[PDB]
Write an enzyme that holds these catalytic residues in place. Sequence first.
Site, PDB file in Angstrom:
ATOM      1  CG  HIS A 192     -84.645  64.136 101.534  1.00  0.00           C
ATOM      2  ND1 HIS A 192     -84.706  63.559 100.283  1.00  0.00           N
ATOM      3  CD2 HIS A 192     -84.525  65.482 101.395  1.00  0.00           C
ATOM      4  CE1 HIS A 192     -84.648  64.568  99.418  1.00  0.00           C
ATOM      5  NE2 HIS A 192     -84.525  65.747 100.046  1.00  0.00           N
ATOM      6  CD  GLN A 199     -83.073  63.464  95.821  1.00  0.00           C
ATOM      7  OE1 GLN A 199     -82.703  64.388  96.569  1.00  0.00           O
ATOM      8  NE2 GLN A 199     -83.323  62.259  96.281  1.00  0.00           N
ATOM      9  CB  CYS A 245     -81.369  63.043  99.396  1.00  0.00           C
ATOM     10  SG  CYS A 245     -80.956  62.079 100.856  1.00  0.00           S
TER      11      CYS A 245
END
Length: 328
Positions: free
Chosen positions: A271, A131, A137
Amino acid sequence: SHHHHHHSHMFHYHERELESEEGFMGMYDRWREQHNIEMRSPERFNVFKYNVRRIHESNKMDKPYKLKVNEFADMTNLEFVNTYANSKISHFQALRGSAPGSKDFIYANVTKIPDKVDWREKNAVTDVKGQGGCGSCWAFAAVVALEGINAIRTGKLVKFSEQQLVDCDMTNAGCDGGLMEPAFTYVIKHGGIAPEASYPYVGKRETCDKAKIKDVLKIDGRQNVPGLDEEALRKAVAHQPVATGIQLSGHGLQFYSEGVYTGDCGTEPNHGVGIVGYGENEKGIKFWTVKNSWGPTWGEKGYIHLQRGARKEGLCGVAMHSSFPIMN
């Protein structure tokens, strides 16, 4: 060590290297070379010694997981979390959504579910992605669940576009963060999600490009898993991969290498991750199998086995805000 009974891409070192500045400097230069890091300074060396000492001490403790001196060893945990676990899921959930645990849950009445599930073994999970610094995320977690449902139904595993969600989903905040549930709403309301091959990942928000939106996966609905209930989460995972928030702070998580993570963890997800399975190891430790977006050099080729049944919220807040797409 004989007395250890909770246990059973790696950087090797000898304990003697920690005993002197010369040995530690030699280890630091070897670490830099093996991870293709050129940058060095007295401050970064200081951070490296601090992290290595904590990794070394942690690995002397009896627990079912191990840490490794990975490429993030010259980053403080504060720099690491601010760079890689900054998607603000708990923050946006408090501003926009409901408290964890609050039509009905589609899997509510299921009684018979397998003891072990691994979606990676069923061609429903794509390779691990990276990422970068982007707080996207929420888009990676939504995409794990979308790739999963598509592959389960059609039998063809297709990588879908996180970038389309980052650029086009105006209800979310791009690289500043967002939530999985509205990302699924965007896919429903706005025509579907394009394959990664058509709308590739750039790691920064760019102009929504309608020309790259083609050969789309279309979905019908989405729902949250009833929160604070790891058994309801197990029922949903038994049918398909589930998108969820997790908190990935602390040195235990920056350096996680293998085994079932049972260490310190908070309940403020920062996250988004995809839950692709669950099981129980040989020592009776129950776990969730979580796909992360930090590339294949972190954890077990990009995965983390998190303890299942640890607390009401789930370890790392895994069972607080979970959601999945529906194709009915």
